[PDB]
Design a protein around this motif. Structure first.
Motif, PDB file in Angstrom:
ATOM      1  N   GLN A 187     -32.701 -47.262 -24.162  1.00  0.00           N
ATOM      2  CA  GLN A 187     -32.916 -46.804 -25.558  1.00  0.00           C
ATOM      3  C   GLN A 187     -33.515 -47.962 -26.356  1.00  0.00           C
ATOM      4  OE1 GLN A 187     -30.168 -45.413 -29.339  1.00  0.00           O
ATOM      5  NE2 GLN A 187     -29.783 -44.527 -27.316  1.00  0.00           N
ATOM      6  N   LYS A 210     -22.511 -35.613 -19.102  1.00  0.00           N
ATOM      7  CA  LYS A 210     -23.505 -35.704 -20.204  1.00  0.00           C
ATOM      8  C   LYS A 210     -24.797 -36.317 -19.648  1.00  0.00           C
ATOM      9  CE  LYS A 210     -24.198 -37.345 -24.955  1.00  0.00           C
ATOM     10  NZ  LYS A 210     -23.634 -38.114 -26.088  1.00  0.00           N
ATOM     11  N   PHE A 211     -24.659 -37.373 -18.844  1.00  0.00           N
ATOM     12  CA  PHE A 211     -25.781 -38.095 -18.193  1.00  0.00           C
ATOM     13  C   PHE A 211     -26.548 -37.146 -17.267  1.00  0.00           C
ATOM     14  CE2 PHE A 211     -27.835 -40.814 -15.054  1.00  0.00           C
ATOM     15  CZ  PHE A 211     -28.430 -41.759 -15.858  1.00  0.00           C
ATOM     16  N   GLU A 220     -24.010 -45.144 -19.579  1.00  0.00           N
ATOM     17  CA  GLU A 220     -23.377 -43.875 -20.024  1.00  0.00           C
ATOM     18  C   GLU A 220     -22.176 -43.611 -19.110  1.00  0.00           C
ATOM     19  OE1 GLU A 220     -23.377 -41.805 -22.893  1.00  0.00           O
ATOM     20  OE2 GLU A 220     -21.659 -41.784 -21.518  1.00  0.00           O
ATOM     21  N   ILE A 222     -28.531 -34.566 -19.271  1.00  0.00           N
ATOM     22  CA  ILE A 222     -29.732 -35.151 -19.939  1.00  0.00           C
ATOM     23  C   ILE A 222     -30.829 -35.363 -18.889  1.00  0.00           C
ATOM     24  CG2 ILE A 222     -30.635 -37.166 -21.147  1.00  0.00           C
ATOM     25  CD1 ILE A 222     -28.878 -35.090 -22.788  1.00  0.00           C
ATOM     26  N   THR A 281     -34.278 -42.660 -23.733  1.00  0.00           N
ATOM     27  CA  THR A 281     -34.093 -41.871 -24.974  1.00  0.00           C
ATOM     28  C   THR A 281     -35.474 -41.466 -25.497  1.00  0.00           C
ATOM     29  OG1 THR A 281     -31.996 -42.899 -25.360  1.00  0.00           O
ATOM     30  CG2 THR A 281     -33.063 -41.931 -27.299  1.00  0.00           C
ATOM     31  N   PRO A 304     -33.030 -42.748 -17.140  1.00  0.00           N
ATOM     32  CA  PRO A 304     -33.668 -42.006 -18.225  1.00  0.00           C
ATOM     33  C   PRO A 304     -33.885 -42.902 -19.454  1.00  0.00           C
ATOM     34  CG  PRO A 304     -31.330 -41.457 -18.143  1.00  0.00           C
ATOM     35  CD  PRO A 304     -31.616 -42.380 -16.975  1.00  0.00           C
ATOM     36  N   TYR A 308     -29.259 -46.016 -18.693  1.00  0.00           N
ATOM     37  CA  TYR A 308     -30.398 -45.450 -19.458  1.00  0.00           C
ATOM     38  C   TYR A 308     -30.988 -46.547 -20.345  1.00  0.00           C
ATOM     39  CZ  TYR A 308     -27.182 -44.972 -23.456  1.00  0.00           C
ATOM     40  OH  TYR A 308     -26.297 -45.218 -24.462  1.00  0.00           O
TER      41      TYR A 308
END
Ligand SMILES: CN1[C@@H](O)c2ccccc2[C@@H]1O
Lengths: 237, 300
Positions: B70, B88-89, B83, B92, B7, B5, B68
């Protein structure tokens, strides 16, 4: 990098250097076989290793036995040359080892670099100069010691005889290159010029005739004339 | 099928994922790449629209963690990060997939290209060539120099490829000068395979990684390394037959995948002409010689 017309004085500075010429290492006569094929027969050769400053010649005689049962002899000859030059450097005391070795032929660079890996401070250099060292076998006493050798042999000569008593190494090298260029271009004419006047002898410990300074000017003049004529005939100029 | 992923995409950038790439606009609602095949290493790479000098990327394996991207507006690049919070990962990634904000790794089922280019490449070997032990993923860019290149100036940011030098004591046994220089089998088999790589798989992995870094980042030192490892095999009279068979396959897929418009800077004329036409193995690389002749006849 390359030794050329520009950096020519470097030959006569106080850094020990050697020229290596491999043109007479592997020598053959080409002949017909009974069945009408072609074969080569090797004859004795030599490595021409020369300190241009001192005139010291390290003539390593390459006896035909070296080639017995070997393949790709023109390639082996380059590696054999590199092995002998590296053996010669290792045999010299450290303070006598050359700081540079200049090969007359670019094909010698890799064989010599690989044989000299133990000597990272010795620079192996090509030259842009077309040096006539191939005519070394036109010098009678060098030809004689090579052809008579029955085994591998190192013979030490001073290719300048006693010239450095009277002239600089720059002048001695220019005289040598002029004599060798003449011998290379027209050997018969060049040898006639050097050995006509019978009163003039070659001393037992020398290669060239004992010429007075004035006789050297005359000889040098005759060598230039020989070289320019043959240049005319060559290029119809 | 793993996911990397993002951000956000605050700057306009061409994003590469292995041999694929797509253009993302400044502030386009882009949140990453999904359906990434498990079982292979991957590389995600970046070329900014504004500065095509920022060419850089991350080697990673989704089995080794949750990664991820960013954008860092201070260092001005897309950064890979791990992460550690698995939940949480997943949360998201689930949101971004629901909102269909993720491009799908566009693998054709019949297509083995990526497997074929990365067959021997392992993340643990990448991380020894690229040392940043605090991360599970490896940064590479177009400017990074090799340890060998630096011997001829910042050790931390170097590519630690195995040094190969045909005119070195390592390569030339004393008293075997002509033999070892003209036939590199001792250097290949004893020094490199048995000595340093331990096996042909590790040798091939480094060769494949060097090619990919050359192709994806235009990394000059990587290209030197790829050609050196090809030349060391081709200039060896004695190579295991399985190594020659496998090399032919590796090089075939590298030459197949190379963009046509880069063959002029990524292919060394001397090495290829020597390997295909002069070397000991000039008749051992059928697949590679046929694709090179049909795709890059001008080079040869
Ligand atoms: C704090 N970062 C990580 O938890 C993360 C993981 C995936 C996506 C986005 C992010 C976020 O930017």
């Amino acid at each position: 990098g390359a030794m050329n017309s520009s950096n020519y004085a470097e030959l006569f500075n106080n850094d020990i250097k050697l020229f290596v010429d491999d043109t007479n290492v592997y020598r053959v006569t080409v002949h017909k076989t009974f069945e009408g094929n072609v074969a080569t027969k090797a004859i004795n050769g030599c490595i021409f290793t020369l300190n241009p400053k001192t005139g010291h010649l390290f003539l390593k005689i390459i006896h035909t036995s070296v080639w017995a049962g070997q393949k790709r002899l023109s390639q082996l000859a380059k590696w054999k040359t590199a092995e002998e030059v590296s053996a010669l450097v290792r045999s010299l005391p450290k303070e006598e080892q050359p700081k540079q070795i200049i090969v007359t032929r670019k094909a010698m660079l890799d064989p010599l670099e690989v044989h000299m890996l133990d000597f990272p401070n010795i620079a192996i250099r090509p030259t842009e100069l077309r040096l006539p060292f191939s005519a070394a076998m036109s010098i009678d006493k060098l030809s004689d010691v090579v052809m008579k050798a029955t085994e591998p042999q190192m013979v030490l000569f001073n290719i300048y005889d006693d010239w450095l008593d009277r002239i600089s190494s720059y002048t001695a090298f220019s005289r040598l290159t002029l004599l060798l260029r003449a011998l290379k271009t027209n050997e018969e004419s060049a040898k006639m010029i050097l050995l006509s006047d019978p009163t003039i002898t070659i001393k037992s410990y020398h290669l060239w005739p004992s010429f007075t300074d004035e006789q050297w000017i005359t000889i040098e003049s005759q060598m230039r004339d020989l070289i320019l004529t043959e240049y005319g005939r060559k290029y119809n100029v | 099928m793993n996911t990397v992923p993002f951000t956000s995409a605050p700057i306009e950038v061409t994003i590469g994922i292995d041999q694929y790439s797509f253009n993302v606009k400044e502030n386009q609602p882009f949140h990453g790449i999904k359906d990434i095949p498990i079982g292979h290493v991957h590389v995600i790479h970046f070329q900014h629209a504004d500065n095509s000098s920022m060419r850089y990327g991350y080697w990673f394996d989704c089995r080794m963690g949750n990664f991820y991207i960013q954008y860092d507006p201070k260092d001005g690049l897309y950064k890979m990060m791990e992460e550690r919070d698995g939940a949480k990962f997943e949360n998201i990634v689930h949101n971004f997939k629901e909102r269909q904000m993720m491009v799908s790794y566009p693998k054709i089922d019949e297509d083995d290209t990526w497997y074929n280019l990365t067959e021997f490449v392992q993340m643990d070997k990448i991380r020894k060539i690229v040392r940043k032990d605090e991360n599970q993923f490896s940064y590479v860019d177009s400017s990074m120099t090799t340890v060998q290149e630096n011997e001829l100036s910042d050790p931390a940011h170097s590519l630690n490829y195995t040094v190969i030098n045909f005119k070195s004591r390592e390569a030339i046994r004393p008293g075997h000068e002509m033999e070892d220089f003209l036939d590199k089998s001792y250097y290949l088999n004893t020094v490199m395979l048995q000595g340093i790589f331990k096996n042909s798989s590790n040798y091939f992995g480094e060769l494949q990684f060097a090619f990919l870094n050359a192709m994806f980042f235009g990394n000059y030192g990587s290209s030197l390394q790829w050609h050196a490892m090809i030349e060391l095999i081709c200039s060896s009279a004695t190579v295991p037959k399985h190594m020659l068979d496998k090399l032919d396959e590796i090089l075939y897929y590298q030459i197949k995948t190379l963009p046509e418009q880069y063959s002029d800077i990524l292919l060394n004329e001397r090495v290829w002409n020597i390997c295909l036409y002069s070397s000991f193995q000039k008749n051992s690389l059928h697949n590679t010689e046929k694709i090179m002749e049909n795709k890059y006849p001008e080079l040869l």
